[PDB]
Each structure stands twice: as structure tokens, then as C-alpha cells.
Design a protein around this ligand. Structure first.
Ligand SMILES: CC(C)CNC(=O)c1cc[nH]n1
Ligand SMILES: CC(C)CNC(=O)c1cc[nH]n1
Lengths: 412, 412
């Protein structure tokens, strides 16, 4: 029946690093990747900072000629994907290429490319729209280009569930493997929404921290003085592999993906219910999916976006699911350091949860200077905490009240 | 052993009609929904026609104020979804709401809303971007809004696989039910890409027919004079239901969804391999998934987009999968009449495949006046053909060489 699914490769671009080891070092050091934005003039914007991928060189991966036609989210997705596949040691052959697929998603996709092509259309005319505009901007083309570059003939798709995308992409890819639709999936998310429409759109919703004077202090999940999320760019990709397939080739296994939960809040497009009932249903689904006692959960990588409503509803959900055990587990928001990578948030955070299992350390929630009312769990304030982690849970919640939970455990 | 999945409700907005029965009356009458586009100045564009939804009244579904918050593609997906739920007679209760989910996707999503917000951003600056710009434009908001409106707490997601979206959405929803993760899913696709960036984008890629003098004859799949696809808008939704759940409430069952296939070409971004090998793999995968012999297929609803390369490669794939049986089955492109609904193409064509089973009639390929070299199958040229149909296949192929096949069978 269901096969087991393990993680054999990981790849990342984040505001903390151009790969997983560099990003993970920043996470354990409590380093902010948040800074005033340099690539554009934001003087008319109420938010002028975020998590950029600094010093990204697409020519470490792709020819300048190809990169020129690709939105940054595609470039970032491909880079993370290429890293994950190399990290896995997998050899794509005629014998296995039909069994290897990709599910790399995005919440927003090629908004920069769309904004630039809009400029061309309105300032000049449709004769100035790029012939590459559509395939260089649409969300499924991380999966599409990665399949073309590596010869992957397996299931090829893209999820778009806003800030849940990365979590759902990994969960559904794991289901593809579990049910025998594939033996290997490259799965994760990528995002680059840091153009005028992205910063302006989230700005127009009053969703973003306006702490321009101290950008590294802006993302402060569960802190009394939090005032909305920090917009960040990048990508995470994991190589997911059927367990017996991984054993057969002698793959290095990072961890086992044991649980995946999905749910809808069915409450509000942009706001969670105050009790976090949707997050609670999702986590319980994932825990049952994993065949676990909630007391087995040692570490939660929270969605923890630094929004007033979101942070407290997530505490509410965790308290509901874990009762007294909510006081024994460690929960942290790596968004304290990375900001909110939106569609990629769940992907980089799946990787941070797996590395919490490899290194037996809970990443910190930086900036948690004054926990808010009812935020009385172990939220790993300020500094990484070495502790026993056998089971780690990663939560993502998105616009539309779409929820995803991944459960990872150490593997023998 | 998996659970069986049946279709109990369908909804649609197409260039042929504001519901399923009006659209299907057009399909079987050989009617075109293609006309010069009226909603904009297309003087600088090489294509000035497409398949618009004519006379759509969002206030039959939403308050004017809910509707102002949402891109047209979201309005269209909600319309089709509300039709399908209503058509199914399903009653959402506290007992079942956790078992009812939604997978409504889009290929390109909120291009019109992005265009309109770009105009404000460049004319007046970011203070003029709508607060609802992001949640009202993102592809998962059909799934999100439908779940909030109907109280659906089951799996909530959206696929974006370009022109394969509707096929994949329906196939993965069917997997959700087959493997016990939901009892009911609303699945399909919506698209409204007939704006400047849509006609501009595909036009820059020379992907579109430029037959501005005869818009109704532009979409001519397998015809020697074909010159690119016709851009169309609309939406398809199906209520997928676990068979025992459908029978227990006395649901009317249109057909059974017995097979789903996915594959990647891993070849080119916008053109198939000339042998259609990825499409051949995808169809074999869906037939193996259904436990069917190729000889059991009576009707194929082709991808059939009216592109020089795609039409011919789809013939090669069908000839390769079905050998001698390629000449017994009937295959037609309803895009001859509807044009290419992109992300919604596979959703409306799944509905047309189900109604081909219900009514025992292969819809025509209109405008097939001079079939091209090797286009010598039964392509149902010009006129609907009544015939035995026990098994219908629906193919969708999209940018990145992402392929999906659905297999439907008569339910007695
Ligand atoms: C609905 C919003 C956009 C995201 N939701 C959360 O932040 C959350 C927290 C607890 N449950 N959902
Ligand atoms: C790969 C493009 C975007 C579409 N694909 C086809 O048209 C096709 C035909 C036979 N096999 N693939």
C-alpha cells in the first residue's frame, strides 16, 4: 500500500545564504537576512526593506542567454532544484527518468516579469512584450524547465496555495511517491514578489511591517510590538524518494516525511479564526497521518509570520492540539530571521525542520523581546536551543484559509 | 484497492454558454463562440478576436461588493463551482464538511487585475494599488472563496500547470478521493487571459492564429491551413464523489472517472516532440491506471489546439498508443468551437467527455476542411457523430511539456 518517503537532497536560496549550509548557519547564528531594498526606488512605499537573495549568480547554474528570459522566481526555483538533485546523488537514467517528477510551486510567480511587460505594453505598446513573457513568468515553468534540463519524465506540476505553497508542494509530491505515481519527486517552492506590485499590493493591505528604521528587528513573531510580516525572496527544493528506492541506491537519508495534513479554515480570505481551528484540524490530520501521539512532537517550525492575528491564532491551535505537551515541545519562527518567503516559506522551513532533526537543535525566534499575552510556550527566544528532536512539524497557513502541516522524523 | 470516483455535478462558463447545457447545445450544433474582442482597443495587436464569456452576471453568484474584490478568472471559477455543487444536490453539514475539498486552478490567473493595478501603479503610484489586489488576484482564491462560502474544510488547493491545469486539477482531486483523503472534491479550472498581456504575450510568441478576417474559422485543428490557437476565457468545475457516498444520498451519476495519467515530455518549453512520446506515455499511464486495454477507448477529446506542431504530434501519440484501434475510436477537438481556454481547457473538455458518454455522441472538429498529412483518423469533421462510447479519454498538454489524461467510463 502506501510506501514510505524520505528526504535525500535539499537546495535553497534565502536571505541568509545561496545554499542550505550557508542558510542553516545563519539560522543557528540568529542572523537577520533583512535589509533596505537596493534593486529599486521605494521612497513612495510605506515598507522599504525585506529579505533579498544577496549576490545570486544565475550563471552558476544557467547560461546568461537562458536566464535573461526567466523571471527571478524561476531562476531561484531552478537553482534550489539543481542544488537538491546534486545533493541527492541521484543519477537520472532511461531506467528511472519516467519515475522522477517535479512539483515546484509559487504563491505569486513572475510578478516582476509581469510588471516589466506591463510597463512595455502601457509605455510603448504590445509590440514590445517579450516573446518569452508567458513561459518566463507562469508558475508551472520551474517544474517545466527543471524537467527539460534534467530529463525528468515523471509527474510534472505546480501548486499555488499562496503562503502554504511550499508545504503543500512537498506534501502532495510525497503522496505521489507514497501511492506509486513516482519513485522520486523534486518538490518545494520559489518566490520573488519584491517589485512595485508586490510591495505595493501587500502595503495596500497594511500586511507588512513598516519598521523601516530597524529592518532586522521588523520580523518579531509573538512579540507585543509586531506590526505585520517582512516580504522575502528565495526558494527551497527537496528530493523526496521512496524509502526502498533510497536504500537500494545507498542514498544518504536526512529524515523521513511521515505526516501530511491539509485543511481549509473556511472562515476568511485574509484573517485566521482567533482559535486557529483550521491550523488545529490540519495538525491533527498530519499527526494521525503520521501514526503519532501528539506528545512525540519535539519541535514545531511555526508559520509565525509576525502578524498580530496570525501569531496568536497559531499559539491557540498548538495549545488546542498538544494541551499540556504544548509546554514541553519547542516552537520557533525562522521568519524572525528570513522574513516571509510566501510560496517558498514552507519549502525553506521544511528544510529547516529536517536540519533541526539532523543537528538536534531548535532554531531561535529572534526579536522575541516581549512575548505577547498567552505566548507562554517555549518559543526559543533569541538563541538556538540544542534539545532532543525525534519528530518535527512545519506549519504553513495561506490566503483563503488554506493550511498545510508536514511531519518529519529522524530515520535509522 | 482504491475507492471509486464518480462525477455527480458539473458547471461551466464558456464562449458557447453561461452553463453546461447551453455550452453542450453549442458543441453538438457545431457553433463557434469566437468573435472580435469588444472589451478593449486591440489596434496595435496581431490578433483581435477570441472566445469571450458573453453576458456573464456575477451578481447571480456574489454581491457586487464581494465580486469587486476578485479578478474575472476567480469570478468565473466560483460561477462554475457554484453551478457544479448545485447540480450535484450535495448538502454540506457539520458531519461531512471536513470531507469536502476544492482544487480549482488557473494557468495564468489574475492577468487582468495585474494589468489594471499596473496602470494605477505607473500613472498615480503605489497608493492607488487596491488593498484586495493580492488576495483578489492569486490562483488559489477560487478554492479559498468557495470553501469560505460553502463551509468546506477538506483539502483546499490549486494547481497551475498552464494549459494542463484543468486536467491535473480533476485528476489529483480524484486521487484525493480514491485514497480516502476526501469524500467530495470540487475540481476544475478557470481562465480570463483575453487582456493586453494575454493577447500581447501569446502574440509576441507567434502562438496565436492571426485570421482576424474570419474569427469563427481560425480554430481548425488538423486542418492544413491552421496557424495557431485561439485564446478563450471561461471555467469548468466537476463535483467528484466517492461512489458509496454518491449512492448513499441517491446522487445522479454522470460517469465514473477510472483513469488519470501525468507525464513530462522533458523536451521543449512550447513545442512537443514530433512523435508525441510524452503524450503517448501519459495516455498509457491513464489506461494502466484504469486497468483498460487501449482497444476499450471509443472517444478522445483531443488537446487539439490548432497549432502546426501540437496537432500532428497528438495524432502520432494516438497512433502509437492505439495502433490499428486508432482508426476505430473517434477523436475531436472541441477547441475548434470554444477556442483554447488554457487552464480551463481540460475542465470544460472533461465535462464535454462526460456528456459525450451521457449522450453517446462524439462532438465535431469544426473547420476541418482539408485534414493535413497523416491526419487520417476519424476526427469527427464538421458534424457531431452519434456512436457507442463506453470509454472517453481527455488529453491536455501545456508549456514545459506537462501532460495529463483523464479516462471516464459509462456508469450503469
Ligand atoms: C488566513 C491567514 C492568511 C493565515 N492564517 C494564519 O495565520 C493562521 C494562524 C492560525 N491559523 N491560521
Ligand atoms: C508541449 C506543448 C506546449 C504542447 N504539447 C503538445 O501540443 C503535444 C502534442 C502531442 N504531445 N504533446
Amino acid at each position: 500500500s502506501r510506501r514510505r518517503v524520505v528526504i535525500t537532497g535539499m537546495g535553497m536560496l534565502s536571505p541568509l545564504g545561496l545554499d542550505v549550509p550557508s542558510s542553516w548557519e545563519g539560522i543557528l547564528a540568529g542572523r537577520s537576512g533583512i535589509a533596505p531594498i537596493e534593486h529599486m526606488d521605494l521612497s513612495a512605499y510605506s515598507t522599504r526593506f525585506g529579505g533579498s537573495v544577496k549576490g545570486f549568480n544565475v550563471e552558476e547554474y544557467l547560461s546568461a542567454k537562458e536566464a535573461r528570459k526567466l523571471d527571478l522566481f524561476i531562476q531561484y526555483g531552478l537553482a534550489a532544484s539543481f542544488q537538491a538533485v546534486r545533493d541527492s546523488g541521484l543519477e537520472v537514467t532511461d531506467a528511472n527518468r519516467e519515475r522522477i517528477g517535479v512539483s515546484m510551486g509559487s504563491g505569486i510567480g513572475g510578478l516582476t516579469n509581469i510588471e516589466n511587460n506591463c510597463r512595455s505594453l502601457f509605455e510603448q505598446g504590445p509590440r514590445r512584450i517579450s516573446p518569452f513573457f508567458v513561459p518566463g513568468s507562469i508558475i508551472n515553468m520551474v517544474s517545466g524547465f527543471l524537467s527539460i534540463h534534467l530529463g525528468l519524465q515523471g509527474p510534472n506540476y505546480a501548486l499555488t496555495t499562496a503562503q502554504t505553497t511550499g508545504t503543500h508542494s512537498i506534501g502532495m509530491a510525497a503522496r505521489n511517491i507514497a501511492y506509486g505515481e513516482a519513485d522520486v519527486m523534486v518538490a518545494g517552492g520559489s518566490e520573488m514578489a519584491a517589485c512595485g506590485l508586490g510591495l505595493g499590493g501587500f502595503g495596500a493591505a497594511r500586511a507588512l511591517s513598516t519598521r523601516n528604521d530597524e529592518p532586522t528587528r521588523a520580523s518579531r513573531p509573538w512579540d507585543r510590538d509586531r506590526d505585520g510580516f517582512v516580504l522575502s525572496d528565495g526558494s527551497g527544493a527537496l528530493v523526496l524518494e521512496e524509502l526502498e528506492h533510497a536504500r537500494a541506491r545507498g542514498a544518504r537519508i536526512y529524515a523521513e516525511l511521515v505526516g501530511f495534513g491539509m485543511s481549509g479554515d473556511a472562515f476568511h480570505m485574509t484573517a485566521p479564526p482567533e482559535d486557529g481551528a483550521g491550523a488545529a484540524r490540519c495538525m491533527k490530520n498530519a499527526l494521525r497521518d503520521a501514526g503519532l501521539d501528539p506528545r512525540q512532537v519535539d519541535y514545531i517550525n511555526a508559520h509565525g509570520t509576525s502578524t498580530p492575528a496570525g501569531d496568536i491564532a497559531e499559539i491557540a491551535a498548538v495549545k488546542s492540539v498538544f494541551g499540556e505537551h504544548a509546554h514541553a515541545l519547542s516552537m520557533s519562527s525562522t521568519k524572525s530571521m528570513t522574513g516571509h518567503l510566501l510560496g517558498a516559506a514552507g519549502a525553506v522551513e521544511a528544510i529547516f525542520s529536517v536540519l533541526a532533526l539532523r543537528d538536534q537543535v531548535a532554531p531561535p525566534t529572534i526579536n522575541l523581546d516581549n512575548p505577547d499575552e498567552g505566548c507562554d510556550l517555549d518559543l526559543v527566544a533569541h538563541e538556538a536551543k540544542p534539545r532532543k528532536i525525534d519528530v518535527a512539524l512545519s506549519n504553513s497557513f495561506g490566503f483563503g484559509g488554506t493550511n498545510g502541516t508536514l511531519v518529519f522524523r529522524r530515520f535509522a
